[PDB]
């Protein structure tokens, strides 16, 4: 909901999400849910987007319909934002709990310090129940059980009511008598001698003593009720990226063009299989959008949202690249999904560049991922 507005070149060449699982599809209130996935930080990181030196993994929910029980990048608890490396792959897991019933599109995002939000794929999740049945029982280090929905609620309201009552009394002790015009006339004609009231002085002294005593008493009561408190935590989170997997496929992009009055992405590449087993391309992924063919369809998550899957991946030679062979391929990603996600908007971009993930498979089922990027040329079919 807004990711399509984000300029393509940016998202296409920033975070390349892959293998994203949302579940369960339908959960009751107070039950657990999980969003898992992986993402690659593209080597062709756009200049417009700042380096991910302070990255926070966020959830793109319509509202806090889920309470984020935990977020873990790789295996490190990502409560505090931290730096991530470009050209490296990471795994994320978000554990949530159902709060508000309804149908909600639930996304993955990576908020970068200066770049901004990088939204990811989305799927519809359903919550069945009642928001008034929601309870989130937590246990504190000091040894007390609380509920996150109702915690420190009566305390704040109580102190607010007390101080607001004192303030209202102070204000209203003067808004009970001639207050604007007669005072102005008396002050402008006779000075302030008749405008000072000893009863007001007594009230002022009593209220000042009461205010100071209340401040001191509240502070002492709070410091006696909770002797041990920790400050607001800060710092940064740090996790080692996933180890670089050996890739027998090397790809060099030679040409790339996109139709301005149409929907198509044509990329010319030189692929080299310097491994020892035939390799066949099956999927092109960018901005969560996936273009697949028979090979890609063979290894496909049956529960991935079908609104971001397009069977439109075509090669001039749809043959497996034999080991030790360099081949010139022309990939054609064409479907209406390009119009929905606005590949069309590359003509007004200050940087006409494409990027994505090209996925390939072995005869035994092993998967290789290549991050490909380059400059795209507009093709005016209307001419």
């Amino acid at each position: 909901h807004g990711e399509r507005s984000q300029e393509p070149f940016l998202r296409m060449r920033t975070v390349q999400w892959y293998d994203i699982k949302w579940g369960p599809e339908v959960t009751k209130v107070n039950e657990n849910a999980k969003i898992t996935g992986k993402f690659h930080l593209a080597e062709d990181w756009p200049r417009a987007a700042a380096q991910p030196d302070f990255s926070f993994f966020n959830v793109g929910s319509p509202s806090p319909v889920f309470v984020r029980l935990s977020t873990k990048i790789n295996g490190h608890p990502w409560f505090i934002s931290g730096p991530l490396q470009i050209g490296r792959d990471y795994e994320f897991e978000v554990n949530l709990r159902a709060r508000i019933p309804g149908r909600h599109h639930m996304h993955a995002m990576l908020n970068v310090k200066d770049a901004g939000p990088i939204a990811g794929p989305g799927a519809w999740m359903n919550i069945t129940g009642s928001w008034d049945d929601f309870t989130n029982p937590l246990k504190l280090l000091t040894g007390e059980t609380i509920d996150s929905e109702t915690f420190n609620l009566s305390n704040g309201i109580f102190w607010h009511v007390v101080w607001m009552s004192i303030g209202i009394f102070w204000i209203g002790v003067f808004t009970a008598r001639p207050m604007f015009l007669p005072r102005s006339r008396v002050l402008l004609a006779y000075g302030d001698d008749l405008l000072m009231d000893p009863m007001d002085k007594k009230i002022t002294w009593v209220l000042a003593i009461l205010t100071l005593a209340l401040v001191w008493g509240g502070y002492r009561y709070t410091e006696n009720k909770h002797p041990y408190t920790v400050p607001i935590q800060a710092g940064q989170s740090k996790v080692a990226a996933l180890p670089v997997a050996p890739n027998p496929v090397s790809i060099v992009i030679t040409d790339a063009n996109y139709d301005v009055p149409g929907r198509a992405l044509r990329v010319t590449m030189e692929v080299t299989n310097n491994g020892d087993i035939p390799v066949t391309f099956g999927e092109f992924t960018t901005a969560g959008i996936r273009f697949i063919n028979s090979t890609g369809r063979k290894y496909l998550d049956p529960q991935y949202p079908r609104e971001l899957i397009a069977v439109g991946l075509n090669f001039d030679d749809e043959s497996a690249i034999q080991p030790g062979q360099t081949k010139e391929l022309k990939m054609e990603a064409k479907d209406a999904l390009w119009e929905i996600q606005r590949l069309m908007a590359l003509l007004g971009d200050p940087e006409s560049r494409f990027g994505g993930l090209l996925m390939s498979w072995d005869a035994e089922g092993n998967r290789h991922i290549n991050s490909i990027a380059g400059p795209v040329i507009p093709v005016f079919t209307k001419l």
Binding site: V67, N111, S148, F151, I171, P182, R185, Y190, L214
Partner: protein, 274 residues
């Protein structure tokens, strides 16, 4: 029980004039209240509202420094207006009460009932004891410079102890996934803010030049010191805000500043009324 009849007799108001004055008060005072709500709320939220909105932004460095400096501004000007024009000592308290009324209305209707955030997570909270003590200082001293010094010190110093009963319990430690957090931090992580990630928090971070046991205390004094300046500056701004003249013109088409004066305030006008 105060001395109102003497004040009315000194003003030489017939009963119909007294009723007309009462109607003026009953019409104008709610207008001033609503204007304070609106404008003061806008100013506070767009200068210091971020620490105001969320529980995990209330820290020892920026919250107790930014909040009183922003809050003292409208209070000083409204106190100038009320005290100088009508000898009314309830300016700062009225400002803070209006700000809190607006804040509570928006938190209940905007943050909670529309955005589904819990009410306890959006307690603002109060800034009232400092305003009350500033009003008491202005009334008891009757001098606005001594008021600037002492009341600004009070306003900058009493902010954190006055808010501690509200946000002190939120600092209890919790352990999540083997990591220590304050309960405010876990509340912030639990309730997803799509537009507010963690790294945007302008909160304490520690330093090699920092005495962790004194942080708030230092923040309690700096916020006081600037307040003593800010009050004074905005007090003069009050004189700017009370500038009431007309651009009159005549003949060559020349424009002259003209002031409408109160006839009752002249030298011999009250004696000639009878």
């Amino acid at each position: 029980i105060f001395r109102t009849e003497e004040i009315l007799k000194a003003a030489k108001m017939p009963p119909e004039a007294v009723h007309m004055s009462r109607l003026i008060d009953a019409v104008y005072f709610p207008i001033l209240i609503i204007l304070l709500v609106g404008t003061y709320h806008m100013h506070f939220m767009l200068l210091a509202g971020d620490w105001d909105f969320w529980m995990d932004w209330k820290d020892r460095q920026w919250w107790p420094v930014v909040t009183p400096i922003v809050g003292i501004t409208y209070c000083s000007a409204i106190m100038y207006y009320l005290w100088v024009n009508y000898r009314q000592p309830f300016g700062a308290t009225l400002c803070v009460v209006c700000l809190l009324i607006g804040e509570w209305l928006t938190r209940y209707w905007g943050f909670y009932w529309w955005s589904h955030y819990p009410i306890n997570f959006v307690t603002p909270g109060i800034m009232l004891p400092g305003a009350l003590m500033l009003d008491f200082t202005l009334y008891l001293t009757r001098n606005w410079l001594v008021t600037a010094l002492v009341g600004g010190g009070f306003f900058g110093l009493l902010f954190y102890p006055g808010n501690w009963p509200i946000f002190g319990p939120t600092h209890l430690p919790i352990v999540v996934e083997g990591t220590l957090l304050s309960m405010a931090d876990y509340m912030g992580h639990l309730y997803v803010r799509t537009g507010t990630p963690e790294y945007v928090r302008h909160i304490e971070q520690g330093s090699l030049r920092t005495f962790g046991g004194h942080t708030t205390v230092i923040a309690a004094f700096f916020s006081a010191f600037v307040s003593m300046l800010m009050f004074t500056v905005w007090w003069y701004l009050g004189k700017v805000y009370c500038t009431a003249f007309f651009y009159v013109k005549g003949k060559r088409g020349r424009i002259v500043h003209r002031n409408d004066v109160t006839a009752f305030g002249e030298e011999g006008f009250p004696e000639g009324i009878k």
